[PDB]
Write a protein that binds this ligand. Structure first.
Ligand code: CL
Ligand code: CL
Ligand code: CL
Length: 208
């Protein structure tokens, strides 16, 4: 059936933390990217209508990981969801900074199966410097980025509109510079389940 149904069949597949160890999967995958692991995990559970899929209550340790999730039946998946690690708001100095820079840029630019990126940004504070870097890393691919302005229930109606238009304007600058891939945006609220049908429809458009 629907993209909703397929999403709801989701299950955890594997974790991954080096470029060479990405699963050799046939199917297309979507990447979820963002400063917040909290918001990512919460977005994945709501899109799949599950309580306990995306590691929502797991306490960050010393290391980070990509996580893969079958879409459709786990025995016979029709896609994967790739939760890329939250870069937060400042970058952690140390040998793992380089590692993750190389990994993510090479993944974004050359992972054959990757058909697009969902970029999760707090509506109150869109488009940080690290958000911008994920955009620029994806540039050469000509692949799309859909931006979710998250926690949109915390803004007034006017403020949310203002945020849509501000992000739109920032995204156009990229197109005007020559950015090949399609840049879109919507409001999104995990808590109030806002923007969910639009989020499903976009995903369906990419995967099928
Ligand atoms: Cl978020
Ligand atoms: Cl690490
Ligand atoms: Cl949200």
């Amino acid at each position: 059936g629907s993209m909703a149904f397929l999403l709801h069949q989701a299950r955890f597949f594997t974790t991954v933390n080096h470029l060479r160890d990405l699963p050799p999967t046939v199917q297309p995958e979507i990447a979820f990217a963002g400063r917040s692991n909290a918001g990512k995990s919460t977005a994945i559970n709501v899109l799949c209508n599950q309580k306990r899929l995306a590691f929502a209550s797991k306490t960050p340790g010393r290391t980070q990981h990509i996580n893969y999730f079958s879409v459709g039946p786990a025995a016979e998946p029709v896609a994967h969801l790739v939760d890329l690690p939250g870069y937060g708001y400042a970058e952690v100095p140390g040998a793992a900074k380089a590692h993750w820079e190389q990994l993510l840029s090479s993944y974004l630019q050359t992972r054959p199966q990757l058909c697009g990126m969902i970029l999760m940004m707090d509506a109150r504070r869109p488009l940080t410097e690290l958000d911008r870097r994920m955009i620029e890393w994806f540039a050469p691919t000509g692949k799309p980025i859909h931006s979710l302005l998250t926690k949109c229930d915390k803004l007034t109606r006017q403020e949310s509109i203002n945020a849509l238009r501000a992000t739109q304007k920032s995204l156009d600058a990229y197109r005007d510079a020559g950015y090949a891939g399609k840049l879109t945006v919507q409001l999104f609220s995990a808590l109030k389940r806002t923007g969910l049908d639009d989020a499903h429809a976009l995903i369906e458009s990419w995967l099928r």
